[PDB]
């Protein structure tokens, strides 16, 4: 990866090639863990994208490396997009700002498209167990939601529908298959409720979605050993915080 490069615009030197295909998974994984320590998420992403394109199922650790990588890559755009639009909404110079907002949007989309593409071609296709399927549908939900944050007209409608369908499917499976303390399920509830709150703008359903997931987990918490406990509660804190805000 000393022989790789990513463009500003979120297009890269590409992974669909002998160079990345001739690498051992174990290498790519270590390259990713490094890149992560080094906070270089373009690299980490590229690495995981290449691990996914080998077409084997991802282990747990592998799922999260993928998730974290793309989270940071796309998150950097979403942040910038809010700053820019906020500066726009506060205001000759507006053409220039608007153009810049759109440069960011274009970047947001390639990254989302890339991720949605990986989810469809590889990750969901081969899910092979409920927990994984839930993780990937939640992710599909999330990346469509990031698109919806910047979408407009009927592009907005399609986007929203596609996010809602993924979340809902994930929501059902998680309820059928997973303990209410499971961090993936809680994380899904959290993001689904945010979708309800900020995208659909039904704030009361957002609260009920979160309160429910919270309450049902709180019941089954004396179950857990310390280690799992910490995983779940980190997310519950977020559920509870959101509820406080959405009732302030």
């Amino acid at each position: 990866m000393h022989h790789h490069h990513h463009h500003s615009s979120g297009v890269d030197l590409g992974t669909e090639n002998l160079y990345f295909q001739s690498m051992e998974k174990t290498e790519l994984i270590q390259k990713a863990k490094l890149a992560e320590q080094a906070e270089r998420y373009d690299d980490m992403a590229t690495c995981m994208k290449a691990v996914t394109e080998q077409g084997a199922e991802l282990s747990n650790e592998e799922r999260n490396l993928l998730s974290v990588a793309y989270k940071n890559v796309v998150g950097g755009r979403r942040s910038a997009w809010r700053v820019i639009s906020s500066i726009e909404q506060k205001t000759k110079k507006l053409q220039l700002i608007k153009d810049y907002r759109e440069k960011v949007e274009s970047e947001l989309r390639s990254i989302c498209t890339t991720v949605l593409e990986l989810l469809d071609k590889y990750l969901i296709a081969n899910a092979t167990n409920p927990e994984s399927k839930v993780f990937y549908l939640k992710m599909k939900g999330d990346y469509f939601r990031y698109l919806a944050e910047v979408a407009c007209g009927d592009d907005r409608k399609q986007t929203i529908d596609n996010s809602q369908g993924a979340y809902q499917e994930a929501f059902d499976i998680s309820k059928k298959e997973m303990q209410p303390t499971h961090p993936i399920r809680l994380g899904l509830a959290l993001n689904f409720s945010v979708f309800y709150y900020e995208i659909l703008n039904n704030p009361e359903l957002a609260c009920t979605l979160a309160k429910t997931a919270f309450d049902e987990a709180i019941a089954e918490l004396d179950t857990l050993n310390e280690d799992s406990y910490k995983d779940s509660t980190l997310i519950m804190q977020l559920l509870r915080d959101n509820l406080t805000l959405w009732t302030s």
Binding site: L188, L190, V194, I235, N242
Partner: peptide, 6 residues
């Protein structure tokens, strides 16, 4: 900040 899953 609203917040979403880590």
């Amino acid at each position: 900040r609203q917040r979403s899953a880590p």
